[PDB]
């Protein structure tokens, strides 16, 4: 338990996908800042459960003696008893391919999902579970996600409601529970807004008793891509 993650359930979160090997992630809150590389643990100890927690974040790289800010904005973490996921609310980003200038581009992105993975071979024999929780995205962390898993058929389906953008109140189509290469319980399915397939989604089952689900969704709205983070518990 450090103090730079104790600025203000799951105790540790290995940051592997949210920061690449060549850059650094600087997270700041209440006047305190900590820097992380790839693989560095993020102490979620002092963080409170089931609340989306915000930090100011910058992605920094070193180019021949000068600090370069690749992107900057809000870094959001959702912490549960056995799982946790992190997202990137981008306020400024560098157009390293077209213009070379920093642009205030508002964009959502989901970086990491970690926790106590439920082994696919150790799933409940039968019965039904219902997970209620939070779906968050750009400008809205108040979305309500209700998912249901039938362990007898090893299937799941759900819904998102109470999102600021009405086109993102989608139906989570029925999908099969399948194992990963490491044999982890994962569901992957389609996104149904107004009886039409409008994107894809993925969730992972977390906890020794499959008490949590957490993952991402990608929706094709009239404005294009839309990234949503999902996390529900019993």
């Amino acid at each position, epitope marked *: 338990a450090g103090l730079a993650d104790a600025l203000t359930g799951l105790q540790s979160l290995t940051l592997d996908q949210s920061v690449r090997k060549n850059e650094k992630l600087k997270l700041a809150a209440q006047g305190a800042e900590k820097t992380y590389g790839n693989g560095d643990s993020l102490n979620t100890g002092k963080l409170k459960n089931d609340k989306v927690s915000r930090f100011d974040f910058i992605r920094q*790289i070193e*180019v*021949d003696g*000068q600090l370069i800010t690749l992107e900057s904005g809000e870094f959001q973490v959702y912490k549960q008893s056995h799982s946790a996921l992190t997202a990137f609310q981008t306020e400024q980003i*560098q157009d*390293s391919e077209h213009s070379g*200038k*920093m*642009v205030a581009k508002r964009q959502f992105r989901i970086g990491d999902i970690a926790g106590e993975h439920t082994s696919f071979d150790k799933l409940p024999e039968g019965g039904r579970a219902t997970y209620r929780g939070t779906a968050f995205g750009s400008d809205d962390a108040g979305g309500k996600l209700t998912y249901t898993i039938d362990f007898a058929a090893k299937q799941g389906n759900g819904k998102i409601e109470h999102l600021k953008s009405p086109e993102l109140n989608v139906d989570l189509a029925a999908a099969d529970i399948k194992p990963d290469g490491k044999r982890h319980a994962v569901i992957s399915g389609s996104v149904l807004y107004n009886q039409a397939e409008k994107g894809s989604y993925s969730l992972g089952i977390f906890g020794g008793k499959a008490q949590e689900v957490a993952g991402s969704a990608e929706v094709k709205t009239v404005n294009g891509i839309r990234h949503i983070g999902l996390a529900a518990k019993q």
Partner: antibody
Framework: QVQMQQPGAELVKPGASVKLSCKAS????????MHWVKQRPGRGLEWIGR????????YYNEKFKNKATLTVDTPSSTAYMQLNSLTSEDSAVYYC???????????????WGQGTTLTVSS | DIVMTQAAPSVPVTPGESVSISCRSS???????????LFWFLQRPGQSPQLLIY???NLASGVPDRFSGSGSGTSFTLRISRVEAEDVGVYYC?????????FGGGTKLEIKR
């Protein structure tokens, strides 16, 4: 230890084609875009184009559309500009300059090449 | 195409005095990010251009404080405070806001010795 090695001068017959090189050392080539500038004798500077060793996207000037071809060899840090159907109006000094692809730095047009003196005559 | 106009082909100044060079554009050089993307260069005789001013205000590495950069969106000025013989050369203004990058016509510093 920024170094932009350009050949001192190049002499070619009119109507032929020449490749002008700009070798880079002392800085991370991939993160820096490479721009080319042409100055005719007794005249001002003119921007030709920009190459990106990261991606390969090349932004040309409309005037030099069919006159210049930009290439980059990232493995051995070098940029090349190919000039075809050379006329007299192309005899000039050509500079290569670096330009960090990220905003937030002083490493933009700070280091320039010495400049290749291209003379087109028989 | 952004037209950069240097009104004065040459500019006279007695040694030890101060002097200004004017640059004009066709579109505003102020992007939405707030930075004014204007570069000022000095070309000494027989030498490649050297960076003088970046972002329209900030001095480069190892360049005297007597050089100043002002201007707002279409009108910009470079001010030399205590002119020395080393400051002689041809001054250029170039925008890097919109492609293609366009250079100024050129203004020559002429010291009235």
């Amino acid at each position: 230890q920024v170094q932009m090695q350009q050949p001192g001068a190049e002499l070619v017959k009119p109507g032929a084609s020449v490749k002008l090189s700009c070798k880079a050392s002392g800085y991370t080539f991939i993160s820096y875009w490479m721009h080319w500038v042409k100055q005719r004798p007794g005249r001002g500077l003119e921007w030709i184009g920009r190459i990106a060793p990261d991606t390969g996207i090349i932004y040309y000037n409309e005037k030099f559309k069919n006159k210049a071809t930009l290439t980059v060899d990232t493995p051995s840090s070098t940029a090349y500009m190919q000039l075809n159907s050379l006329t007299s109006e192309d005899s000039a000094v050509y500079y290569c300059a670096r330009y960090l692809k990220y905003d937030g730095s002083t490493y933009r047009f700070d280091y320039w090449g010495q400049g290749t003196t291209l003379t087109v005559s028989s | 195409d952004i037209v950069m106009t240097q009104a004065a082909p040459s500019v006279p100044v007695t040694p030890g005095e101060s002097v200004s060079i004017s640059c004009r554009s066709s579109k505003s050089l102020l992007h939405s990010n707030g930075n004014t993307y204007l570069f000022w260069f000095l070309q000494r005789p027989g030498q490649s251009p050297q960076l003088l001013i970046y972002r329209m205000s900030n001095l480069a590495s190892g360049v005297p404080d007597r050089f100043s950069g002002s201007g707002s969106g279409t009108s910009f000025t470079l001010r030399i405070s205590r002119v020395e013989a080393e400051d002689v050369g041809v001054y250029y203004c170039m925008q890097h806001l919109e492609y293609p990058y366009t250079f100024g016509g050129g203004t020559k510093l002429e010291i009235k010795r």
